[PDB]
Amino acid sequence: LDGQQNFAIRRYDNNGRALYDINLAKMENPSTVQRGLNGEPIFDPFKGFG
């Protein structure tokens, strides 16, 4: 089934227009968030997440 089926959770904007995919099977070298000194992830509204 792995080499036969494809699944994801795509994000859509408020108008219902799709934005991006998030497909774990197609995710090549994924990453976790850079957490601060209190476990709070590093994030800028524009640059994104660390």
Add this chain to the structure above:
Amino acid sequence: LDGQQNFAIRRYDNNGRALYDINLAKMENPSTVQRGLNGEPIFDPFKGFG
């Protein structure tokens, strides 16, 4: 000479009393700073460096 000599750069407080030693040869599992999204290292005056 690596197995015969030991060198470091020790940090002293304002009165001149030693605090710690940074010996690279004896440094077991060293680490680099966690930089933010602008390259600024994450640091708290009390918790230390990330």
